[PDB]
């Protein structure tokens, strides 16, 4: 579970992402679509071309939810209740895909935060993305 140090590392790392959150959100999505083609099955209506205004748009939404999760890291379940319902009842993305996006987010942060992506921060972020995924999959069954 998230320890104080974890919460502290997440906040420090994410705060450095800052205004770049949208861009990183879009880059992680692109890395996911290329590395794991099966993830594209959930976005059949999207323009998945490189530089797609639609991927840029979705990346910003995902980044905003994460920024919000970081802000309410102590109360993530309640904070993400509505997004959890959305995925559980409407989107119905198989749980396995959450690990794929988490990995790509982590790869994106590594590529952009040379100094901040330390082994300890790396572990905290992986745990953070894991808790988020768990929250979003809590209402599936």
């Amino acid at each position: 579970v998230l320890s104080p140090a974890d919460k502290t590392n997440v906040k420090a790392a994410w705060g450095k992402v800052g205004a770049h959150a949208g861009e990183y959100g879009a880059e992680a999505l692109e890395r996911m679509f290329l590395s794991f083609p099966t993830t594209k099955t959930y976005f059949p209506h999207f323009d998945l071309s490189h530089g797609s205004a639609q991927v840029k748009g979705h990346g910003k939404k995902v980044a905003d939810a994460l920024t919000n999760a970081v802000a309410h890291v102590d109360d993530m379940p309640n904070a993400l209740s509505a997004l959890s319902d959305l995925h559980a009842h409407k989107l119905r993305v198989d749980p396995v895909n959450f690990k794929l996006l988490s990995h790509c987010l982590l790869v994106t942060l590594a590529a952009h935060l040379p100094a901040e992506f330390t082994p300890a921060v790396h572990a905290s972020l992986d745990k953070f993305l894991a808790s988020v995924s768990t929250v979003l999959t809590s209402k599936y069954r």
Binding site: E30, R31, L34, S35, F36, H103, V107, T108, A110, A111
Partner: peptide
């Protein structure tokens, strides 16, 4: 394998493009 990809991203920065990552995956 997944840890290594993160490490290559961290060490190379922008060189580790999405398509280079797919090749490494």
């Amino acid at each position: 394998g997944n840890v290594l990809v993160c490490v290559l991203a961290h060490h190379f920065g922008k060189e580790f493009t999405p398509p280079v990552q797919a090749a490494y995956q």
